[PDB]
Design an enzyme around this catalytic site. Structure first.
Site, mmCIF file in Angstrom:
data_model
loop_
_atom_site.group_PDB
_atom_site.id
_atom_site.type_symbol
_atom_site.label_atom_id
_atom_site.label_comp_id
_atom_site.label_asym_id
_atom_site.label_seq_id
_atom_site.Cartn_x
_atom_site.Cartn_y
_atom_site.Cartn_z
ATOM 1 N N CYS A 51 0.808 -1.216 0.000
ATOM 2 C CA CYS A 51 0.000 0.000 0.000
ATOM 3 C C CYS A 51 0.847 1.274 0.000
ATOM 4 C CB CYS A 51 -0.919 0.008 1.222
ATOM 5 S SG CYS A 51 -0.008 0.182 2.786
ATOM 6 N N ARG A 64 4.610 3.033 12.394
ATOM 7 C CA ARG A 64 3.171 2.923 12.585
ATOM 8 C C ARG A 64 2.722 3.990 13.578
ATOM 9 N NH1 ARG A 64 1.454 -1.784 10.575
ATOM 10 N NH2 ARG A 64 0.645 -0.358 8.961
ATOM 11 N N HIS A 76 -2.275 6.663 4.718
ATOM 12 C CA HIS A 76 -0.828 6.470 4.855
ATOM 13 C C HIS A 76 -0.089 7.695 4.305
ATOM 14 C CE1 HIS A 76 -1.048 2.508 6.391
ATOM 15 N NE2 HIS A 76 0.073 2.050 5.867
HETATM 16 N N1 LIG Z 1 -4.889 -3.192 5.532
HETATM 17 C C1 LIG Z 1 -4.355 -2.480 4.535
HETATM 18 O O1 LIG Z 1 -4.382 -1.249 4.530
HETATM 19 C C2 LIG Z 1 -3.719 -3.271 3.366
HETATM 20 C C3 LIG Z 1 -3.512 -4.657 3.476
HETATM 21 N N2 LIG Z 1 -2.948 -5.408 2.389
HETATM 22 C C4 LIG Z 1 -2.816 -6.896 2.419
HETATM 23 O O2 LIG Z 1 -4.123 -7.465 2.100
HETATM 24 C C5 LIG Z 1 -4.341 -8.704 2.805
HETATM 25 C C6 LIG Z 1 -5.626 -8.545 3.634
HETATM 26 O O3 LIG Z 1 -5.605 -7.336 4.424
HETATM 27 P P1 LIG Z 1 -6.705 -6.781 5.447
HETATM 28 O O4 LIG Z 1 -7.919 -6.391 4.698
HETATM 29 O O5 LIG Z 1 -6.025 -5.764 6.281
HETATM 30 O O6 LIG Z 1 -6.991 -8.055 6.378
HETATM 31 P P2 LIG Z 1 -8.036 -8.415 7.543
HETATM 32 O O7 LIG Z 1 -7.301 -9.224 8.545
HETATM 33 O O8 LIG Z 1 -8.718 -7.180 7.984
HETATM 34 O O9 LIG Z 1 -9.066 -9.330 6.720
HETATM 35 C C7 LIG Z 1 -8.711 -10.667 6.330
HETATM 36 C C8 LIG Z 1 -9.599 -11.733 6.945
HETATM 37 O O10 LIG Z 1 -9.681 -11.577 8.362
HETATM 38 C C9 LIG Z 1 -10.878 -12.179 8.874
HETATM 39 N N3 LIG Z 1 -11.439 -11.328 9.980
HETATM 40 C C10 LIG Z 1 -11.385 -11.689 11.279
HETATM 41 N N4 LIG Z 1 -11.978 -10.806 12.098
HETATM 42 C C11 LIG Z 1 -12.403 -9.878 11.254
HETATM 43 C C12 LIG Z 1 -13.118 -8.714 11.579
HETATM 44 N N5 LIG Z 1 -13.421 -8.428 12.842
HETATM 45 N N6 LIG Z 1 -13.478 -7.873 10.559
HETATM 46 C C13 LIG Z 1 -13.167 -8.132 9.269
HETATM 47 N N7 LIG Z 1 -12.482 -9.258 8.969
HETATM 48 C C14 LIG Z 1 -12.087 -10.152 9.927
HETATM 49 C C15 LIG Z 1 -11.719 -12.478 7.623
HETATM 50 O O11 LIG Z 1 -11.813 -13.912 7.464
HETATM 51 P P3 LIG Z 1 -13.138 -14.623 6.834
HETATM 52 O O12 LIG Z 1 -12.659 -15.283 5.547
HETATM 53 O O13 LIG Z 1 -13.601 -15.633 7.872
HETATM 54 O O14 LIG Z 1 -14.188 -13.549 6.597
HETATM 55 C C16 LIG Z 1 -11.034 -11.701 6.490
HETATM 56 O O15 LIG Z 1 -11.240 -12.194 5.171
HETATM 57 C C17 LIG Z 1 -3.049 -8.914 3.605
HETATM 58 O O16 LIG Z 1 -2.186 -9.841 2.941
HETATM 59 C C18 LIG Z 1 -2.404 -7.534 3.756
HETATM 60 O O17 LIG Z 1 -1.007 -7.461 4.091
HETATM 61 C C19 LIG Z 1 -2.572 -4.755 1.178
HETATM 62 C C20 LIG Z 1 -2.768 -3.368 1.049
HETATM 63 C C21 LIG Z 1 -3.338 -2.658 2.138
#
Ligand SMILES: NC(=O)C1=CN([C@@H]2O[C@H](COP(=O)(O)OP(=O)(O)OC[C@H]3O[C@@H](n4cnc5c(N)ncnc54)[C@H](OP(=O)(O)O)[C@@H]3O)[C@@H](O)[C@H]2O)C=CC1
Ligand SMILES: NC(=O)C1=CN([C@@H]2O[C@H](COP(=O)(O)OP(=O)(O)OC[C@H]3O[C@@H](n4cnc5c(N)ncnc54)[C@H](OP(=O)(O)O)[C@@H]3O)[C@@H](O)[C@H]2O)C=CC1
Lengths: 367, 367
Positions: free
Chosen positions: A135, A267, A274
């Site tokens: 990102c 962070r 960001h």
């Molecule tokens: N966060 C950011 O700003 C960025 C992140 N990334 C990358 O993208 C990937 C995913 O990132 P990100 O979206 O942050 O990941 P999250 O951890 O927020 O979401 C991933 C999974 O976590 C589970 N989850 C558990 N508790 C929750 C909750 N309370 N709310 C929502 N989801 C939950 C879900 O599983 P289930 O399948 O059961 O629904 C979901 O699909 C990573 O590899 C990361 O490094 C890349 C660019 C930006």
């Protein structure tokens, strides 16, 4: 109509990505399928006006049936399924957000507005895996795209102000929660505007220093402080998050020669955007007006902010960008070290251009 | 038993300075006094066996009676009383924390650990005004003192992570308050850890973007974002806060030649500590072990932190420094641009070494 599978659509990124697809009516051209890793069998999103149930994110057979796969689940999932799926003979398209397959041969890092050519080339070359870069880098290139695109960069030195949303939902919710805990402990002292400051101070310094704050997802409190280390520790003095800077930038740009990129990824209590402070060294003494003209002439989202104290406060801040597709650049000028040293400060939603948007745009290319 | 007058001891600084003087039994060698510019007549501090009532910090005759004056009030007061006082013929000592007289001929910027010699010379030359430098700079020199002290610095590029406490009490209380407002608006959604993240997200982004957040002291929300501009706007592209970097550094160090210092000063949700990310260019290729050895061998507070992911998180953070006289430096290593580029990241309480301490230590010198 292609059968497009969606994994990790519930997470922080998946959610932004879903919300965006609805806006641009992205579901109209595809056949949506919704997988899960913990709610398998339950009711499906129905974003694309589709009625079904959450599919087995881990069902290889079920996965082999789709023409494309969009994951916002995580690198742990990728490293687990991808190698196993490609092995099964699956020749579909894999669009990922996780870092896993970024520096892999069968994968291309995507940033349409910055490297469409590379994308296309790899597309006509057999590449079926398209991954979005970090990102922060993704954001840097979107904001400072014009410079690189003109071979004006000698090397870059960054110091990032990364938001809590980068670590995921649990991380954000944690910050917000930590925030509440902090305030509450001194809600009364704050209620009395004259009450001594030290009283309020001690009270909050103690809370933090006391393991009372929820730090399960950060290891340490972030609400009222910061952390100088983002990703894992590399075999060098670099932290994985920082090392991504140079590696990915050259891959994305498909540079003929390594453009030195390095700095410190920190962070902070930033909620969603960001921000980055640069100290770029130009190959030649380019006038700032030329620079500004270039940055703006690279892509419709690269917006140059004037070096104004008022404007800067009103626009070059997460609060003024969070939720927008704009990637502002301000505080542009030459540093005292010399005219070859350009100082810049960018800000951008890392969930859009830094995450969801690149994929969303790519999906439409293969739809 | 000199007549030491104290002004502006109520604020974020005076409080700290006061609390410290008790700890060190500073009041024992001096006959204190306590003026005020907003509560004249009310109760006196009762610190060094001297209880009474706040006096008039505007009574020239009254001020002329003291042998030394220690103000933590602010620039507005100084600019107002100092000129008028020195005119009256007052030949006493004036210890200030306010920027006002820093760059003035009759003043000396104090940082005992970093520039005792200069202090002393100026003392033997007739200088009667001793001012503390900007928290940021003061902190940088305390942390990176060894480098300058050895003429190893070619120029410096900083990106600051400044705490809310820098703007004063009202500023901190504001952040904390803004913090509470943010959490509260989503206390229920946070109560349900399984709820949708966008709902929570939308809810906090709306609050910020809405003028409902108290931003009287900052102009814009800071709780969940940051501000790329600290002080007023200078006639150049520099912001007064950044400009202080180069000017004061050379004054304090009494350099024979200007050491280019520049960068970006940003305000963050940090509660009390000022952290800085450097990109220093060395004159020669000095080995990091030499550097570390130097930094640590400069002053008892300069503590070098190893480039460890664990340690860094546990020590190179405001939460682990706030309230301590230690000025840590970590993330030390060479940048990809070359072995002449040293990368560092410091953290330190700007209210102690960045504020009170320099004065406290100086006063004792004149007691
Ligand atoms: N966060 C950011 O700003 C960025 C992140 N990334 C990358 O993208 C990937 C995913 O990132 P990100 O979206 O942050 O990941 P999250 O951890 O927020 O979401 C991933 C999974 O976590 C589970 N989850 C558990 N508790 C929750 C909750 N309370 N709310 C929502 N989801 C939950 C879900 O599983 P289930 O399948 O059961 O629904 C979901 O699909 C990573 O590899 C990361 O490094 C890349 C660019 C930006
Ligand atoms: N903040 C920092 O960490 C540093 C500040 N400085 C410098 O010191 C000078 C003063 O700054 P600082 O002490 O931070 O400012 P503050 O506003 O926190 O305190 C200074 C004065 O503010 C007044 N005040 C008004 N409302 C309050 C309140 N609610 N609580 C406590 N005090 C209040 C007091 O005046 P009264 O007694 O009349 O009520 C007090 O003497 C500035 O020139 C600054 O640049 C230098 C280094 C660091």
């Amino acid at each position: 109509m292609k059968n497009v599978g969606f994994i990790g659509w519930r997470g922080m990124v998946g959610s932004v990505l879903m919300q965006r697809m609805v806006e641009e009516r992205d579901f109209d051209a595809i056949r949506p399928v919704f997988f899960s890793t913990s709610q398998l069998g339950q009711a499906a999103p129905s974003f694309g006006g589709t009625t079904g149930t959450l599919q087995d994110a881990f069902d290889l057979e079920a996965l082999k049936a789709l023409d494309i796969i969009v994951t916002c689940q995580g690198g742990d999932y990728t490293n687990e399924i991808y190698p196993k799926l490609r092995e099964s003979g699956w020749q579909g398209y894999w669009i990922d957000a996780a870092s896993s397959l970024r520096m892999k041969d069968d994968a291309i890092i995507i940033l349409d507005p910055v490297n469409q050519d590379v994308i296309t080339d790899g597309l006509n070359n057999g590449i079926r895996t398209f991954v979005g870069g970090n990102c922060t880098v993704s954001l840097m290139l979107m904001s400072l795209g014009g410079l690189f695109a003109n071979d004006l960069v000698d090397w870059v030195s960054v110091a990032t102000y990364q938001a809590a949303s980068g670590g995921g939902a649990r991380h954000m919710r944690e910050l917000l929660t930590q925030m509440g805990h902090l305030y509450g402990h001194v809600a009364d002292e704050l209620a009395t505007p004259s009450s001594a400051i030290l009283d309020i101070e001690r009270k909050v310094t103690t809370l933090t220093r006391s393991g009372e704050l929820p730090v399960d997802n950060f290891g340490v409190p972030l609400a009222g402080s910061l952390i100088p280390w983002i990703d894992k520790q590399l075999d060098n003095g670099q932290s994985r998050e920082e090392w991504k800077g140079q590696a990915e930038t050259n891959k994305i740009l498909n540079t003929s020669s390594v453009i030195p990129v390095d700095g410190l990824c920190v962070r902070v209590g930033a909620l969603r955007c960001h921000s980055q402070a640069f100290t770029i060294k130009l190959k030649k003494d380019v006038s700032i007006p030329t620079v500004e003209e270039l940055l703006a002439a690279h892509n419709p989202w690269a917006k140059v902010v004037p070096n104004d104290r008022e404007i800067t406060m009103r626009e070059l801040t997460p609060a003024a960008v969070t939720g927008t597709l704009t990637t502002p650049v301000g505080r542009l000028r030459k540093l005292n070290m010399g005219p070859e040293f350009l100082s810049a400060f960018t800000v951008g939603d890392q969930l859009l251009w830094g995450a969801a948007e690149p994929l969303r745009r790519m999906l439409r290319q293969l739809a």
